[PDB]
Amino acid sequence: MGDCANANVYPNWVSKDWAGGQPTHNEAGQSIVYKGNLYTANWYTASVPGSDSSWTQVGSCN
């Protein structure tokens, strides 16, 4: 049903810039899921995982 199941489903970003801040984006090496497919940010981005920007597909949850 969910994009992964219960992982970091976009826009459940990994960070704000720092850990404690409510998120704002995914940084270099930080992964996320977007409709089955798993992606990782190349540098810094908050677009749509897979829509170029700074994304790179690492796999798929489901």
mmCIF file of C-alpha atoms in Angstrom:
data_model
loop_
_atom_site.group_PDB
_atom_site.id
_atom_site.type_symbol
_atom_site.label_atom_id
_atom_site.label_comp_id
_atom_site.label_asym_id
_atom_site.label_seq_id
_atom_site.Cartn_x
_atom_site.Cartn_y
_atom_site.Cartn_z
ATOM 1 C CA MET A 1 0.000 0.000 0.000
ATOM 2 C CA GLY A 2 2.592 2.556 1.168
ATOM 3 C CA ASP A 3 5.530 3.612 -1.068
ATOM 4 C CA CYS A 4 7.814 1.258 0.950
ATOM 5 C CA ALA A 5 5.838 -0.074 3.937
ATOM 6 C CA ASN A 6 7.131 2.082 6.811
ATOM 7 C CA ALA A 7 10.525 3.453 5.627
ATOM 8 C CA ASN A 8 11.412 7.052 4.669
ATOM 9 C CA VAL A 9 8.563 7.633 2.204
ATOM 10 C CA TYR A 10 8.993 11.007 0.417
ATOM 11 C CA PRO A 11 8.580 13.694 1.792
ATOM 12 C CA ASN A 12 9.802 11.931 5.003
ATOM 13 C CA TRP A 13 13.249 13.503 4.400
ATOM 14 C CA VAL A 14 16.241 12.529 6.528
ATOM 15 C CA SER A 15 17.208 16.093 7.605
ATOM 16 C CA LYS A 16 16.693 19.851 7.896
ATOM 17 C CA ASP A 17 20.458 20.409 7.604
ATOM 18 C CA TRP A 18 20.999 19.017 11.126
ATOM 19 C CA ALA A 19 19.421 16.068 12.991
ATOM 20 C CA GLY A 20 17.066 17.715 15.525
ATOM 21 C CA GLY A 21 15.531 20.201 13.057
ATOM 22 C CA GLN A 22 12.213 19.169 11.435
ATOM 23 C CA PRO A 23 13.317 18.089 7.913
ATOM 24 C CA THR A 24 13.629 20.097 4.728
ATOM 25 C CA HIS A 25 15.600 17.787 2.331
ATOM 26 C CA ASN A 26 17.844 14.768 1.659
ATOM 27 C CA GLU A 27 21.627 15.320 1.607
ATOM 28 C CA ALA A 28 24.412 13.434 -0.191
ATOM 29 C CA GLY A 29 24.204 9.688 0.548
ATOM 30 C CA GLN A 30 20.839 10.053 2.375
ATOM 31 C CA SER A 31 18.258 7.646 0.919
ATOM 32 C CA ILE A 32 14.455 7.828 0.564
ATOM 33 C CA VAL A 33 11.626 5.830 -1.097
ATOM 34 C CA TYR A 34 9.205 7.171 -3.719
ATOM 35 C CA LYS A 35 6.506 4.784 -5.008
ATOM 36 C CA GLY A 36 8.251 1.425 -4.629
ATOM 37 C CA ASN A 37 11.626 2.753 -5.881
ATOM 38 C CA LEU A 38 14.455 3.601 -3.465
ATOM 39 C CA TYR A 39 16.711 6.603 -4.279
ATOM 40 C CA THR A 40 19.670 8.433 -2.742
ATOM 41 C CA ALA A 41 20.591 12.093 -3.003
ATOM 42 C CA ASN A 42 23.843 12.974 -4.732
ATOM 43 C CA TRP A 43 24.385 16.305 -2.931
ATOM 44 C CA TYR A 44 21.336 18.195 -1.602
ATOM 45 C CA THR A 45 17.696 18.092 -2.813
ATOM 46 C CA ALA A 46 14.024 18.282 -1.820
ATOM 47 C CA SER A 47 12.384 17.816 -5.258
ATOM 48 C CA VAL A 48 10.886 14.405 -6.185
ATOM 49 C CA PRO A 49 13.064 11.251 -5.797
ATOM 50 C CA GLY A 50 13.931 10.184 -9.371
ATOM 51 C CA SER A 51 13.087 13.511 -11.084
ATOM 52 C CA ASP A 52 16.767 14.198 -11.985
ATOM 53 C CA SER A 53 17.649 17.134 -9.622
ATOM 54 C CA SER A 54 20.241 15.162 -7.554
ATOM 55 C CA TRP A 55 18.642 11.695 -7.420
ATOM 56 C CA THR A 56 19.981 8.262 -8.191
ATOM 57 C CA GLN A 57 17.907 5.067 -7.887
ATOM 58 C CA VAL A 58 19.451 2.600 -5.393
ATOM 59 C CA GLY A 59 16.743 -0.115 -5.606
ATOM 60 C CA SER A 60 13.106 -0.740 -4.705
ATOM 61 C CA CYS A 61 11.305 -1.598 -1.434
ATOM 62 C CA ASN A 62 8.335 -3.013 -3.263
#
